[PDB]
């Protein structure tokens, strides 16, 4: 079946950095451009990252900018999310997905990430 399995979570004070990972099986994953999403209470859902096809073009929501980077591996089809500077206004839920607005199983289950002092 379609999977995205994100992992790399963690608790993490404000400063700190994490790496989110996703696994995606089931789909040709070459054949998709990718994102990060994430939701947090009363934040609702917003888009962090994207990134087309190969990785020759990326995108980033304004808020993470020269913090964040999104990367894909096509041969182990595993998307990326390296996080520095987090800030507790970083804490939420992190989806990958292959659409800004997509729901599962063409978005994962998440994996948290809490930045608290
Ligand atoms: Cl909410």
């Known amino acids: 079946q379609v999977q995205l399995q994100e992992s790399g979570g963690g608790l993490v004070q404000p400063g700190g950095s994490l790496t989110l990972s996703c696994a995606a099986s089931?789909?040709?994953?070459?054949?998709?451009?990718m994102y990060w999403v994430r939701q947090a209470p009363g934040k609702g859902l917003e888009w962090v990252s994207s990134?087309?096809?190969?990785?020759?073009?990326?995108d980033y929501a304004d808020s993470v900018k020269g913090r964040f980077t999104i990367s894909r591996d096509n041969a182990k089809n595993t998307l990326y999310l390296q996080m520095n500077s987090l800030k507790s206004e970083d804490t939420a839920l992190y989806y990958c997905?292959?659409?800004?607005?997509?729901?599962?199983?063409?978005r994962g289950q998440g994996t948290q990430v809490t930045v608290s002092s």
């Open positions: 997905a292959v659409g800004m607005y997509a729901a599962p199983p063409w």
């Open positions: 990134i087309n096809r190969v990785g020759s073009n990326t």
């Open positions: 089931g789909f040709t994953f070459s054949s998709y451009s």
